[PDB]
Amino acid sequence: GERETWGKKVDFLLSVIGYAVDLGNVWRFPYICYQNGGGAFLLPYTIMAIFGGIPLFYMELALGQYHRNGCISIWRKICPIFKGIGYAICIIAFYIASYYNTIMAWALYYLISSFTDQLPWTSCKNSWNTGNCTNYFSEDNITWTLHSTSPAEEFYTRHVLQIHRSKGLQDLGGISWQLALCIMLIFTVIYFSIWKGVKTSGKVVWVTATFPYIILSVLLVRGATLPGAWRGVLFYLKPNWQKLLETGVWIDAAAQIFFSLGPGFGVLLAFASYNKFNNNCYQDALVTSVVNCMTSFVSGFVIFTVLGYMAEMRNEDVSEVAKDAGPSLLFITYAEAIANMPASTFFAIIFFLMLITLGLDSTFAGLEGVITAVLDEFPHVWAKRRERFVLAVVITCFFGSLVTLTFGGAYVVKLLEEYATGPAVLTVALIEAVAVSWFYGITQFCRDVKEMLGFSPGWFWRICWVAISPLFLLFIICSFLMSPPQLRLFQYNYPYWSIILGYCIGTSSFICIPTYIAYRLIITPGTFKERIIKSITPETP
Amino acid sequence: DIVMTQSHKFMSTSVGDRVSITCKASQDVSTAVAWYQQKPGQSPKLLIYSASYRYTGVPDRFTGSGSGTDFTFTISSVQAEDLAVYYCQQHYSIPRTFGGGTKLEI
Amino acid sequence: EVQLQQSGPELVKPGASVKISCKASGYTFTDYYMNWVKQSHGKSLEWIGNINPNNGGTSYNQKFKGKATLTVDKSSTTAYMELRSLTSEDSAVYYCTRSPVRPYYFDYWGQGTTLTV
Ligand SMILES: CCCCCCCCCCCCO[C@@H]1O[C@H](CO)[C@@H](O[C@H]2O[C@H](CO)[C@@H](O)[C@H](O)[C@H]2O)[C@H](O)[C@H]1O
Ligand SMILES: Brc1ccc([C@@H]2CCNC[C@H]2COc2ccc3c(c2)OCO3)cc1
Ligand SMILES: *[C@@H]1O[C@H](CO)[C@@H](O)[C@H](O)[C@H]1NC(C)=O
Ligand SMILES: *[C@@H]1O[C@H](CO)[C@@H](O)[C@H](O)[C@H]1NC(C)=O
């Protein structure tokens, strides 16, 4: 009687779809599709989706629907030895919400600054740029200098970020009041849209996750008809069969699909924890996976048609203009691609709003997962008033992101995106998968799926849950632990101490699970094997 | 990679007449084509970039036209010093590649 | 007014290594790229690699992965090219050209590296 149920069946579907879509399929997926094998990227993408995303998604959805709990205390009914996975998920999601909200802050500042008949980043002639100006081409009579930069580039690095004022990661300079007020407004929006629960989430997703689709569609309509759109699609579909021989393309496709579906994060548990008792979760997982894949595909088309248009109006070979990886692709390149076209105001506004809501829905999903997990873990003093402990986590995440709002926050947000996410979430996901697959009993899980839906899955899903997906996850994490990356951003390299701190942050979340099994022994005295046999099998419901 | 073929090295047009030479491109390019000269023994020098924009410092004798796949390098009535070799360059894709070039006889 | 100096002729035993020089004078060396071209005995031109003075980057050709290692010496406005694992046919004339970022033409060249084997 302490749980709840969604308003309808489409509400949970749209909420999980909004959780499955983010800026990933907007910018990271197409750049990967071009760099990592060209048009020949789709086949390994589909392979890794069938073998790495759908199994995890189906398993987590079914377990969350049956057990009706979060991701912290849900192991009391499954396998209580890995309860630290819950707290690891909480702190991981704290890191994620602290670094992600800065992107929405950038987007909403772009929105609030894009209300003018002449966009402030179209011409370099403002009171902040330097003598290194270089207007959009419009001609072939100019010689671009290495030190010369596009007007939108210097706008993004000198007005919305003030990044040149940062003399290195050792110092920070100062917080920007503009971005501070912007992220404060976005945090108030998140709270006032997440206060009640899934009853309000299912109503706000109707406009939160559906509005991006119409914006993407009108952008595709605008792009696919301009002179030069064909080169974009040709480059997006031109295969390169030699690339699939290297393991790099395969592991990058695996990482892309795993981050696009995002399982093992502890939010599918909370979402399915409100679904009906015997809803068609198999259909739900399949539909969500295909919708996420199709969204990534159509977003790749949308970005690459305008990239090809820009490459025909400017010099060709989008590979050169698509130099850097990150939000700079949208905030600099696509920014100019939109600004140089007629009706630039409305198009920039709708694009910025689409990015804003594609951030907000994912933030909603993550915070829902966190609050539901903690409420299921601590229902004694909490769970009576849900409006409390939500302001707590919102203020904590805001004061954590405060360190990113500084003038040199791009480096730290890219660091948090690169190291705090991948390894921690991958180890957590693989550990919970081998727990619910090797310790809880895959035969018990199949019998449970039978009891819920009405027919047990075939041997294919069985071997995918037992053999394919664990090997897949460990292969990803081992490939990531094979080549230590030395990344950079905006002509600035990352020092070695920055790499050590990134390793520490990316490991301060995996060291969270052993302290639970350590504290399990002090409070409960006795032999080790007794606690092992008590924590390998679940207790009474 | 990118291959820019054209006529042979011997086939050319003598002095006084109009000299038009093309250079076949593998893929399609918008305007990213450039031509060069090199006297036998010396270093190659730039003539025209973007296939139509002559670099600052060349006489009006030089002309560039053609786009897409067919690129016309039209010259006419060369002087006693315009005789040289002419390769076709592009700016499409890494690695950039030149062409075969053509003589100028007589 | 803008002259670029290089090395001269060198007949070297096959298997050894030669370091080519490229002087910059006339235009700001730290503002444009520094590429190299490979041309055989009266044959076509072929691009070799790319050099950036700010960070010493190198986007080498896939056909010259190890045939030439490229470094830059911004103090003397010079950029070397470590030519290791040389054979007889790789004894070709080279050039040091300036090039702005993405018009990709070669304004001023050198004097030709008459490398004999
Ligand atoms: C066993 C428990 C854990 C032990 C400790 C693990 C600590 C790991 C520290 C970070 C390790 C490397 O971290 C990981 O590096 C890879 C490889 O570049 C990055 O990956 C990045 O570059 C690769 C290049 O191939 C791209 O394919 C990929 O899309 C991109 O994200 C990941 O974003 C980062 O998460
Ligand atoms: Br690694 C990793 C693993 C999974 C994901 C999912 C998958 C794709 N769709 C959105 C994304 C959700 O990312 C979040 C954003 C805000 C949040 C949050 C989580 O929790 C607290 O607030 C991203 C990175
Ligand atoms: C362009 O930026 C560089 C960065 O160091 C600076 O040295 C140079 O002075 C700038 N150009 C002008 C004209 O100021
Ligand atoms: C650009 O250069 C060309 C030379 O081919 C010249 O004809 C044209 O007038 C120039 N355009 C300018 C300077 O705007």
DSSP A520-537: HHHHS-S-HHHHHHHHHS
Contact between B91 and C107 using a beta-carbon 8 Å cutoff: no
Please report the sign of the dihedral spanned by the C-alpha atoms of residue B38, residue B44, residue B45, residue B49. positive
Report the side by side order of strands in the sheet with C45-49. Answer: C45-49, C33-39, C93-99
Domain count, chain A: 1
> Which of C47, C103, C112 is facing B43, going by the closest CB pair?
C112
Q: What are phi and psi of A123, to 5 degrees?
A: -115, 135
* C112: Cβ contacts below 8 Å, ≥ 6 apart: B42, B43, C6, C93, C94, C95
Residue minimizing CA distance to atom 11 of ligand 4: A141
Burial of A539 (0-12, 13-18, 19+ CB in 10 A): exposed
Tell me the CA distances in angstroms from B80 to B14, B16, B84, B106, one per residue in order: 12, 11, 10, 11
Locate the chain A residue with the closest alpha carbon to B33: A315
Q: Which residues of A are annotated as a binding site?
A: 18, 20-22, 25, 260, 292, 358, 361-363, 418-419, 480, 483
Q: Name all domains of chain C by residue range, CATH numbers in brackets.
A: 1-117 (2.60.40.10)
Q: Resolution of the coordinates in A?
A: 4.1
Pocket of ligand 4 (CB under 6 A): A 139, 141; B 53-54
Instruction: Using DSSP, state whether B15 is helix, strand or coil.
Output: coil
Chain centre distance of CA A404: 18
Supply A36's token pair. Answer: 């990592």
* Helix, strand and coil in chain B, % to nearest 5: 0, 35, 65
In this structure, how many other beta carbons lie within 10 angstroms of the beta carbon of residue C4? 22
User: Cβ A140–B31 below 8 Å, yes or no?
Assistant: yes
Tokens encoding A458: 């075939």
Cα-to-centroid distance, B52 and ligand 4 (Å): 9
What six digits make up the tokens of A358? 């594609």
Taking contacts as CB-CB distances below 8 angstroms, the residues of chain C near A134 are none
- How does DSSP assign A81-114, residue by residue? GGTHHHHHHHHHHHHHHHHHHHHHHHHHHHHHH-
Q: Could you say which DSSP state residue A388 is in?
A: T
Q: Which residues of A174-198 are buried (b: 16+ CB within 10 A; e: fewer)?
A: eebebbbebbeebbebbbebbeebb
Distance (Å) of CA A356 to CA A189, A292, A324, A352:
11, 18, 22, 6
Phi (first) and psi of residue B72, to 5 degrees: -90, 125
Domain that holds residue A435: 1-541
Helix axes A84-113, A422-434, angle to 10 degrees: 140
CA distance A339 to chain C (A): 21
Ligand 2 contact, A363 CB (< 6 A): yes
Instruction: For Cα atoms A373, A375, A379, give the angle at the middle one, nearest 5 degrees.
Output: 135
Amino acid A23 reads: L
Helix/strand/coil for C87: coil
> How many A-B residue pairs are in contact by the CB < 8 A criterion?
20
Question: Quick one: CA dihedral B91, B95, B98, B100, positive or negative?
Answer: negative
User: A204, A262, A275, A364: which is closest to A12 by C-alpha?
Assistant: A275
Ligand nearest to the CA of A24: 2
Determine the Cα–Cα distance for residues B90 and B29; give it in Å rounded to an integer: 8
DSSP state of B89: E
B14 CB contacts (<8 Å, ≥6 apart)?
A: B105, B106
CA C7 to chain centre: 11
| Elucidated via | cryo-EM
The span from the CA of C49 to the CA of A396, in Å, is 50
Q: Which positions ≥6 away from A332 have C-beta within 8 Å?
A: A150, A152, A153, A156
- CA A461, A462, A467, A470 torsion: positive or negative? positive
Is C72 in contact with C53 (CB distance < 8 Å)? yes
Closest CA to A146 of A160, A129, A134: A134
Could you tell me if A514 and A82 are in contact, meaning their C-beta atoms sit under 8 angstroms apart?
Answer: no
Query: Which residues lie across from B6 on neighbouring strands?
Result: B23
Distance between CA atoms of residues A61 and A248, nearest Å: 30
Residue A334 makes CB contacts below 8 A (sequence gap 6+) with A303, A306, A307, A351
* Cα–Cα distance measured from residue A208 to residue A360, given in angstroms and rounded to the nearest whole number: 8
The token duo for C98 is 């300036």
Beta bridge partners of residue C78, listed in sequence order: C73
Ligand 2 centre distance from Cα of residue A266 (Å): 10
| Cα angle value A299/A302/A308 (rounded, 5°) | 135
d(CA A248, CA A143): 37
Q: What are the tokens at A253?
A: 């496709």
Contact A317, C104 (CB under 8 A): no
Q: CA A475, CA A464: separation in Å to the nearest integer? A: 15
User: Chains touching chain C at 3 or more Cβ pairs under 8 angstroms?
Assistant: A, B
**Ligand 2 contacts CB of residue A96 (under 6 A):** yes
Cα gap A401→A97, rounded to integer Å: 8
CATH of domain B1-106: 2.60.40.10
Please state, in angstroms and rounded to a whole number, the distance separating the CA atoms of residues A294 and A300: 10
Tokens representing residue A324 in the block: 């850097």
Tell me the CA end-to-end span of chain A in Å, nearest whole number. Answer: 14
Looking at this protein, which amino acid is placed at residue A369? G
CA–CA distance, A37 with A242 (Å, rounded to integer): 8
Chains touching chain B through at least 3 C-beta pairs below 8 angstroms are A, C
User: A519-534 burial by CB neighbour count: b if 16+ within 10 A, else e?
Assistant: ebeeeeeeeeeebeee
B54 Cβ neighbours under 8 A, 6+ residues apart: B47, B48, B62, B64
Main-chain phi, psi angles of A427, to 5 degrees = -65, -40
Q: How many angstroms separate the CA atoms of A505 and A448, rounded? A: 37
Segment holding A250, helix H or strand E:
helix A247-261
Evaluate the omega torsion of the peptide bond into residue A44 and state whether it is cis, within 30 degrees of 0.
no
- For the purposes of burial, counting CB atoms within 10 Å of the CB of A508, is it exposed (0-12), middle (13-18) or buried (19 or more)? middle
Instruction: Measure the CA–CA gap between A104 and A96, rounded to whole angstroms.
Output: 13
CA distance A46 to A72: 32
Can you list the alpha helix ranges (DSSP code H) found in A378-485?
Answer: 390-401, 409-418, 422-434, 442-452, 459-463, 469-480
Greatest Cα pair distance in chain B: 38
* Residue B88 three-state SS: strand
Q: Domains of chain B: which residue ranges?
A: 1-106
Residue pair A472/A448 in contact (Cβ under 8 Å)? The answer is no
Q: How many residues does chain C have?
A: 117
In sequence order, which residues have a C-beta less than 8 Å from that of residue A457 and are 6 or more positions away?
A282, A446, A449
How many residues does this entry show for chain B? 106
Question: Is A101 near ligand 2, meaning CB less than 6 Å away?
Answer: no
Q: How far apart are CA A109 and CA A105, in angstroms?
A: 6
> A317 and B93 in contact by Cβ < 8 A?
yes
Residue closest to C29 by CA, chosen among C100, C95, C82, C89: C100
Residue A351 Cβ inside 6 Å of ligand 2? The answer reads: no
